[PDB]
């Protein structure tokens, strides 16, 4: 049954590998948050960054548990796809928001100098360009995510666009 899905999820594996161990560990999540905070040209060991990293940590827990390995174990490529698949398909709605909520949230906190808890087009663009996206890409991705066409991207509409690269990538998830 696998065809185009393999390619998309396959690269995502080799696309990360912080240390290049051939697996996914928790320490890989910690560097991520840090590696990101820097992209916004700000602190490192501050609170906003510590918060995000703090959230990213618990995210691994779900993997070790669902995968059945350990908080200090590792997941293979074939494992990622199998477990990832269920995450996108299986799993409860509140399940993705529960474990990922604090992960995506931490990012919104740094991506808001007004403290409103929402992602405005001016905020979204700032992040897309931060990861290596063009100014024209943000404007396009923004409208695609605004499910309610209200002009504001809330945490809800955030995850939706985020996890949706399986079939015909639209936003390209977090990585970019
Ligand atoms: Ca790794
Ligand atoms: Ca805001
Ligand atoms: Ca919207």
Curated annotation (Swiss-Prot):
One of its GO terms (molecular function) is calcium ion binding. Keywords: Calcium, Metal-binding, Repeat. The keyword Metal-binding applies. Residues 4-39, 44-89, 99-133, 133-168 form the EF-hand domain. It holds the Pfam family EF-hand_7. Ca(2+) 2 binds at residues 112, 114, 116, 118, 123. SMART domains: EFh (SM00054). InterPro entries: EF-hand-dom_pair, EF_Hand_1_Ca_BS, EF_hand_dom. Transmembrane segments: none annotated. PROSITE patterns: EF_HAND_1 (PS00018), EF_HAND_2 (PS50222). It comes from the Bacteria. Gene3D superfamilies: EF-hand. Ca(2+) 3 binds at residues 146, 148, 150, 152, 157. SUPFAM superfamilies: EF-hand (SSF47473). Ca(2+) 1 binds at residues 17, 19, 21, 28. This protein binds calcium. This is Calerythrin. It comes from Saccharopolyspora erythraea.
């Amino acid at each position: 049954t696998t065809a185009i899905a393999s390619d998309r999820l396959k690269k995502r594996f080799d696309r990360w590998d912080f240390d290049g161990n051939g697996a996914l560990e928790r320490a890989d999540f910690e560097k991520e948050a840090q590696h990101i905070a820097e992209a916004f040209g700000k602190d490192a060991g501050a609170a906003e960054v510590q918060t995000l990293k703090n959230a990213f940590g618990g995210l691994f827990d779900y993997l070790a548990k669902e995968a059945g390995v350990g908080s200090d174990g590792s997941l293979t490529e074939e494992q990622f796809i199998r477990v990832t698949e269920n995450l996108i398909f299986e799993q409860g709605e509140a399940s993705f928001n529960r474990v990922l909520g604090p992960v995506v949230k931490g990012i919104v906190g740094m991506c808001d100098k007004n403290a409103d808890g929402q992602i405005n087009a001016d905020e979204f663009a700032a992040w897309l360009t931060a990861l290596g996206m063009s100014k024209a890409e943000a404007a396009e991705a923004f409208n695609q995510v605004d499910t309610n066409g209200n002009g504001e991207l809330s945490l809800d509409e955030l995850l939706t666009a985020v996890r949706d690269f399986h079939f015909g990538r639209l936003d390209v998830e977090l990585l970019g």
